[PDB]
Structure 1
Amino acid sequence: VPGEMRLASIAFNHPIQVDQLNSSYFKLSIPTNFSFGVTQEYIQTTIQKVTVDCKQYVCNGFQKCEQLLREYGQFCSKINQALHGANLRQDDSVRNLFASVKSSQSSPIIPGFGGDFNLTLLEPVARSAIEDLLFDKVTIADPGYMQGYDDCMQQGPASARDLICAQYVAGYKVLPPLMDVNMEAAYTSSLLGSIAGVGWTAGLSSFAAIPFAQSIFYRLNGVGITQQVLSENQKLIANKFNQALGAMQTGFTTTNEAFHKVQDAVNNNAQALSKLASELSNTFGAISASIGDIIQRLDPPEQDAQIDRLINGRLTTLNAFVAQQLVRSESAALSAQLAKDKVNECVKAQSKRSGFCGQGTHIVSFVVNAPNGLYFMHVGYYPSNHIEVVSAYGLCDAANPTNCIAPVNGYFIKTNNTRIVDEWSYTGSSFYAPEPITSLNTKYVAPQVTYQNISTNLPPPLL
């Protein structure tokens, strides 16, 4: 068998140290081998909706209780009103969210979408392969509605143990979801067809309708990778992208934090209902947990007193339950607002913000349905194999001090490339690759003391 535990220190990973330099030039760290990757998150948008038949919960048709309960009948009226208002708010947060995920227009979805990109998210023309993995990995009890109640009833297996049948004993009712899973699938298929792309200016009006692969190349050029590299590596890029998505088939375990959050959203709903069920057997110092039995065993002067003790504790449990539901309903509404913002930023557009997706710039992201919420996947770009190079703040003509230039979305580096005879070269900011300096890569700027003086050859201006 295994031995002793080992005490250990938590490692601190040190950042790569780039030397600070003085003077007119500086050291630059730039990646040479990017790799795609994916991150995931779960954002809850709703609370399961519940109502309670307060009269039935407190007693079960006993007439002595009904007479006694009338003195407290206004408590149940407050309980029902509070739950009803909570359920109305859950319905409104759902409709508000779906009104913004919808696009005015989209591409039709067909097989072979994305060319060389694999794209397993396509509907099985349904839900999706990924949504099916989420619903199958989750341990949630099979839903009611259909057939529902006849799985409570003796016309079924002796092994049913569903809390859902216990709803018809306890007076609970779980309300059906507002949207219907088929419409929910249609709303996220509309988002999938809006991709490719959100570029070309705003994108709230016109719809570009271009191939998915083309929109990816624009997003890669939007993070400072030069176009020359993108044309050379197109098949390589497609393969790395597919490998990043291939890992999604193994990602649905509880070690994946996003998946774990989905599982605990389900657990919280189940626990809230089970608490009410356990309290049906909880005496409050009353002689018995059953009202029919406590009536059967007692003379009426004592009987009424015992029942009132029992009624008051049952009402107190319902009041605590309502307060808990009101808190949870509010947090879900706020969480749904966060989801709405990510659909209108991270899904419908490339994001320049950092801090909001995977930590690798941003490139296209996708969203799928999950229990009680939305599940996001974010493709991202991860740098590796950084090298340090010499770089200059800008370049100027030594014969004419007013002609000066500075790179656009990239840097001027001392050349280390055998193809380029020019002393300086241009590179992308997300990927290292030299290129000749030309007017397409530069802008004219006011002169500055740190700019290098070029004694001879500069192509922009040639003179």
Structure 2
Amino acid sequence: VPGEMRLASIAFNHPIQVDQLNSSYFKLSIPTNFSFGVTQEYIQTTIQKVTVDCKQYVCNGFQKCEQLLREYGQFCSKINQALHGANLRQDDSVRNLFASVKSSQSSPIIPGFGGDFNLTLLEPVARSAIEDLLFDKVTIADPGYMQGYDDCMQQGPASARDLICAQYVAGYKVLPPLMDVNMEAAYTSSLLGSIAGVGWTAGLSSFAAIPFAQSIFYRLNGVGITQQVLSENQKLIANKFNQALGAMQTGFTTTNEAFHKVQDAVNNNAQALSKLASELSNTFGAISASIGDIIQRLDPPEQDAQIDRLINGRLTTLNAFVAQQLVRSESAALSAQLAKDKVNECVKAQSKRSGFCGQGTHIVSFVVNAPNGLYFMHVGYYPSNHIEVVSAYGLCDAANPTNCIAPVNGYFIKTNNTRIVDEWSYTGSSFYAPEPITSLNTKYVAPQVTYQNISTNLPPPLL
């Protein structure tokens, strides 16, 4: 038998402390290792689109209802109009999203795309295997459209339990999406074709058309990793990257919150439909929930008292239902705008902003189709094994105080490396990588009191 639950304090992790230091030099924290890793997100863009027959939800054409309902017929017209407008908004957002998805040009994609990187996200030419993994783990009821109506009907298995057959009892209609999954697959491959890349100016006109690995090297110089380190570690980079890629097969668990969100989008759509279905059996104080039953058993002067109790309650649930749909539709529109923003930032460009994208600086991100939305994933850089080193604000010529320099995208640190005869060395800012100070890594700056007075040799300036 299991042990009793245990009371515990919530742990608080502490940041590595780095002492502030006075004078002309200071401690600097630098990582000595890193790993690739990934994060994921699901952004819903749509609500399932439905309509409701306003005659059938109340009654089945029984004629007492047919005449009594005429007094309330304008409410049905309001209901239908509101639902119709909600569905138009859903289709508007789809077209607007796709207008930013399209590119004037893209690379063709063949197997072996991305070079030594595995790229298992590539289509099995087909929807990508990753999209299919998501679809298989999702618990959603089998789809309508074809065969639709004949999957309700006795010409099919007796074990179907789909709300889609209940669509033809309740008067519901589920509208097809505008987007078409085949056209959608073409759009996601088109996005993959815009990769390599984000660099080389804005990229909003020209198309670089270069290999993926080269664009990665470009991005890593963009975060201060020296070019020399990148050339030494090229296979290491591919190995760590593909280790993170392989971790995606463990990404479909209930502990993955993005995955959980996908499942609840489905649950919410199914839940709304089930609520209206359950209300068909709900008496409103009427003798029975069946209209034909109360007609058969009652004298007509009292018969329609019972019918009106039923009619009023059916209308009331429809009013609540429409209001619920309008709210959800508006939140979906805002959510869709966020997805569009990430496509035009997190995907189409490298970013220095933090915030958006996974939290590990930023390097390329990808997006795939998910039901009712987009599923994003982000490659990121995670620092490790931080050390403290001595560093200086800048260096100057002691023979001439106006000759002052400071590092570009990096730092000047006291050397601890036996290859370098010079007392100081340049390093990258994202990784520990000491190197000789050269004119390529520095810039001239105005003089300042904290800059070191160097009495011997500098190659930048030579004098």
TM-score in same-fold range (> 0.5): yes
Q: Deviations over 1:210-243 (max 9, x none)?
A: 0000000000000000000000000000000000
Distance 2:100 2:117 in 1: 28
Q: Matched residue of 2:253: which SS? A: coil
Q: Matched residue of 1:34: which SS? A: strand
After TM superposition, give the deviation of residue 179 of structure 1 in Å.
1.2
Residue ranges of structure 1 left out of the alignment (5+ in a row)? none
Q: Deviations over 1:293-324 (max 9, x none)?
A: 00000000000111001000000000000000
- Residue 105 of structure 1 corresponds to which residue in structure 2? 105
Distance 2:158 2:197 in 1: 54
- Residue 131 of structure 2 corresponds to which residue in structure 1? 131
Distance 1:190 1:160 in 2: 38
Distance 2:300 2:140 in 1: 45
Distance 1:75 1:90 in 2: 23
After TM superposition, give the deviation of residue 270 of structure 1 in Å.
0.3
Q: Deviations over 1:372-397 (max 9, x none)?
A: 00000000000000000000000000
Distance 1:335 1:241 in 2: 30
Distance 1:9 1:453 in 2: 52
After TM superposition, give the deviation of residue 358 of structure 1 in Å.
1.1
1:179 aligns with 2:171: no
After TM superposition, give the deviation of residue 61 of structure 1 in Å.
1.2
After TM superposition, give the deviation of residue 357 of structure 1 in Å.
1.2
Q: Deviations over 1:28-61 (max 9, x none)?
A: 0000001100000000000000000011100011
After TM superposition, give the deviation of residue 114 of structure 1 in Å.
1.1
- Residue 379 of structure 2 corresponds to which residue in structure 1? 379
After TM superposition, give the deviation of residue 352 of structure 1 in Å.
1.0
Q: Matched residue of 2:56: which SS? A: helix
After TM superposition, give the deviation of residue 413 of structure 1 in Å.
0.1
Q: Matched residue of 1:194: which SS? A: coil
Q: Deviations over 1:307-366 (max 9, x none)?
A: 001000000000000000000000000000000000000101101110111111000000
Q: Deviations over 1:159-178 (max 9, x none)?
A: 11111000100000000011
1:6 aligns with 2:3: no
Q: Matched residue of 1:276: which SS? A: helix
- Residue 433 of structure 1 corresponds to which residue in structure 2? 433
Q: Where in structure 2 are the equivalents of 1:441-456 lying within 5 Å?
A: 441-456=441-456
Distance 1:158 1:461 in 2: 86
Q: Where in structure 2 are the equivalents of 1:8-407 lying within 5 Å?
A: 8-407=8-407
After TM superposition, give the deviation of residue 116 of structure 1 in Å.
0.9
Distance 2:218 2:374 in 1: 27
After TM superposition, give the deviation of residue 184 of structure 1 in Å.
0.4
Distance 1:400 1:8 in 2: 63
Identity over the aligned pairs, expressed in percent? 100
After TM superposition, give the deviation of residue 134 of structure 1 in Å.
0.5
Distance 1:161 1:435 in 2: 68
Distance 1:287 1:462 in 2: 102
Distance 1:397 1:180 in 2: 68
Distance 1:4 1:28 in 2: 47
After TM superposition, give the deviation of residue 115 of structure 1 in Å.
1.0
Q: Matched residue of 1:390: which SS? A: strand
After TM superposition, give the deviation of residue 18 of structure 1 in Å.
0.2
Q: Matched residue of 1:57: which SS? A: coil
After TM superposition, give the deviation of residue 441 of structure 1 in Å.
0.1
Q: Deviations over 1:365-424 (max 9, x none)?
A: 000000100000000000000000000000000000000000000000000000000000
Q: Matched residue of 2:182: which SS? A: helix
Residue ranges of structure 2 left out of the alignment (5+ in a row)? none
After TM superposition, give the deviation of residue 81 of structure 1 in Å.
0.2
Distance 1:273 1:29 in 2: 56
After TM superposition, give the deviation of residue 459 of structure 1 in Å.
0.7
Q: Report the number of matched residues.
A: 463
After TM superposition, give the deviation of residue 290 of structure 1 in Å.
0.1
Q: Matched residue of 2:55: which SS? A: helix
Q: Matched residue of 1:401: which SS? A: strand
Q: Deviations over 1:251-290 (max 9, x none)?
A: 1011100000000000000000000000000001100000
Distance 2:426 2:459 in 1: 12
After TM superposition, give the deviation of residue 250 of structure 1 in Å.
1.1
Distance 1:220 1:114 in 2: 16
Distance 2:382 2:344 in 1: 24
Distance 1:114 1:339 in 2: 25
Which runs of structure 1 show a deviation greater than 3 angstroms over 4 or more consecutive aligned residues?
none
After TM superposition, give the deviation of residue 83 of structure 1 in Å.
0.1
Distance 2:355 2:151 in 1: 48
Distance 1:250 1:39 in 2: 12
